[PDB]
Design a protein around this ligand. Sequence first.
Ligand SMILES: Nc1ncnc2c1ncn2[C@@H]1O[C@H](COP(=O)(O)OP(=O)(O)O)[C@@H](O)[C@H]1O
Ligand SMILES: Nc1ncnc2c1ncn2[C@@H]1O[C@H](COP(=O)(O)OP(=O)(O)O)[C@@H](O)[C@H]1O
Ligand SMILES: [Mg+2]
Ligand SMILES: [Mg+2]
Lengths: 437, 441
Amino acid sequence: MAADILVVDDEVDIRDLVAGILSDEGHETRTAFDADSALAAINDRAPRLVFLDIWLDGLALLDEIKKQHPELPVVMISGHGNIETAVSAIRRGAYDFIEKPFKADRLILVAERALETSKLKREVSDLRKRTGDQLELVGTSLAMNQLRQTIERVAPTNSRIMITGPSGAGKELVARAIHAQSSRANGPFVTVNAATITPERMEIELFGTEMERKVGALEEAHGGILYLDEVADMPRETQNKILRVLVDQQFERVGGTKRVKVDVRIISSTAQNLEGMIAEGTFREDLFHRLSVVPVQVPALAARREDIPSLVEFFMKQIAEQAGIKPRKIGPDAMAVLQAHSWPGNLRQLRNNVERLMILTRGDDPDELVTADLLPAEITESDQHIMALPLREARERFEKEYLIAQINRFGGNISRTAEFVGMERSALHRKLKSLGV
Amino acid sequence: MAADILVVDDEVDIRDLVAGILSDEGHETRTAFDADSALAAINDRAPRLVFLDIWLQGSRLDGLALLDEIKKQHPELPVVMISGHGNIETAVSAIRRGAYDFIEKPFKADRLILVAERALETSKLKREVSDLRLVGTSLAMNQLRQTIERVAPTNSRIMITGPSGAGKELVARAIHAQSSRANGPFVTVNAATITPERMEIELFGTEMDKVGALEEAHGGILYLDEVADMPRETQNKILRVLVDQQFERVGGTKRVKVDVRIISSTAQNLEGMIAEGTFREDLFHRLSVVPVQVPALAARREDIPSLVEFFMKQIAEQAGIKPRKIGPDAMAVLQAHSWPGNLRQLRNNVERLMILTRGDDPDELVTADLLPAEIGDTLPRAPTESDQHIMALPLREARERFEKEYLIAQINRFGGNISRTAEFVGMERSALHRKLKSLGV
Ligand SMILES: Nc1ncnc2c1ncn2[C@@H]1O[C@H](COP(=O)(O)OP(=O)(O)O)[C@@H](O)[C@H]1O
Ligand SMILES: Nc1ncnc2c1ncn2[C@@H]1O[C@H](COP(=O)(O)OP(=O)(O)O)[C@@H](O)[C@H]1O
Ligand SMILES: [Mg+2]
Ligand SMILES: [Mg+2]
């Protein structure tokens, strides 16, 4: 909207003209005539945008501004004569360029777009800190290093990827890392979660509808990557259509005849045994062979236990950022129990456990260690729970469980249990029977 | 970038040149010479970008009318207009109507290349923020939402009070989003996380031999998460920001002017701190021009079922776990709990339930036994040989203690509504009242 802009030019009429139009728009404008006055203005306060004259030199100052302030957009002011240098400045780090003489509306528009893009990148950084959704693969283990090198090798190719690994191991993160290291890194990254899509709406989610517009995952993925997250959750009807899209890169939109042609790089994943599903007749053999082109195996947390301390530390920093809870020191006993667990939910389960620990100790002293007793049990019927029952039934269940527990406490000695609970021997017998013990 | 670009211009010379330059850059370019050919091309496949002439002669709809039709069908599809020299008023009109930018005839190939790249980059960044990104029907939530709506368009300093995980930061972002600084930065300072020795450096930066949060927040909002953790020297410096709209960097005399709207929060008793001499009296009153209280989750138990459903849908989107049916037992337990970690704690427990039931029968209800000890052990449940207090008591005393604990827990669950509690526990309401009075609970 209305930001702090620094106008760097050697001519006063340009400094006054640019600063004038922008200030009149609602911005705060400061000026500088050379590199030293520019660097000093940035030292007074970091601006949200810079307008830099190519011939002051401009390109050297452009490198310096971008070195110290990578997130600060710089728009070049260029002479009518040469666009070659203005284009050279874009490659060196400049956002855009403006040509003399310019219309005021052009100057206003360029400033707004440079600020909008800068705001979008800042909103991206801010939202990644809240989602705890960064694109970095933490792990010093050999399983992690081999995975990182597999990513580095398969990403620059155009090959179809098949990702195998258990739930929460990092299959989606690997797919995003493959995308960020591919030729389609600037192209879209579209995800299809079969598990979280109703069967009655799968066709519409993948192919869209004929004519505000409902655009399917395949059309949205055109020129980029389509991530089929957990293919094993696709019904027979869905498996058929996917196979059919793989043969010709074409499909119809639901309700329509129009055959849309797409150009998509497919990355698939499974935490399931697909070859076994083929034997059970639940998964198509032709689909499997077409999706299983280049394999990428993401290791289980059980295959990289030595990474758990580094991951706990990494997750504690994310939650410190999200919640404002200071990171804690995990006790050697609690860490030993964590490192020994089988982790069916892998890293997603580890993060969830780290977050619960941080919530529970939020009030505690900083020097206090997180102890093994704080760890949950894994590390009756719904109709029978006391909280879900009315008073009489809830009272009856409590009475039954109390007596059962008191009997076990006295190791089956009914007469001593009776005496302690405040009952006569035969009355306890009749009560136990009436309660169905 | 290898994008699908639709080029719409009535001039064949123009279409060929735009399609030619962009196709030579590595893009896939398509052309149309009127509205109907353009809409037929969009129907073939939605492009990633549209170049659109403002005029469009010999067409069913002109350039601005087609711009409107493209944006209606595809709101996130960037449209760059093609305009003639001296047509800037009509081009600026297209920007206000939904166009991303415009290119003025005649243009350099490198200019067209740069406009395409910038439009696509902005489109992609919007796609990221949409992918990554206040629930409750309670009067409490409705009052909070109408408080945000009222004070967000003002320029007044806010003091947000409430327990940890209740939604203070989310309230601050909601105020930011509805304020005149919504396009400005939203900078947070986690005071509980920063060491007292590094607090000044984080807020005010250092002289060069570095950029503080206040300098980053210029033009926007600075969110001071937990003001109680600020040292006395930091307190005096914030006071100068509030009164003088300026400060000095760490180890300097150099003035730094700032235009910030401060939002402060605390889960602590600041009044208790002023009484003890650890927090400045004048600073507290200046920080609390407009007080906003976020209610504890235990004070809005009505919203727990809605929050459970909202959090399930959110984890479904993140993890790819199908949302499940929470058993009446698990819901009764979740609703009755005190929640010292509030909405964060609730969310973390819903995620826990979805992680642990991943791969189980979709019909199978999520039961209360899956919840951890801090949830289950604070509420009525079947006793065991390990429950020292119950075991030390005889039958009548143990049954009376259970009655008291069960009724209180059910009351909590129903937010103190005795008529609703009576209905569930199997009593008439006056009978429940007489039973509570008799029990003295
Ligand atoms: N190597 C890693 N380093 C850091 N965080 C990771 C790593 N692998 C996964 N995560 C995180 O763990 C969680 C689960 O990972 P995810 O990619 O969704 O796995 P999957 O697709 O196998 O279920 C996510 O929050 C993700 O960011
Ligand atoms: N009413 C609400 N509806 C949905 N989610 C909420 C609501 N209030 C808070 N949250 C969520 O609860 C969690 C804790 O909120 P947060 O703002 O971080 O609390 P605080 O700042 O008080 O510690 C976050 O995940 C947040 O998005
Ligand atoms: Mg000049
Ligand atoms: Mg024309």
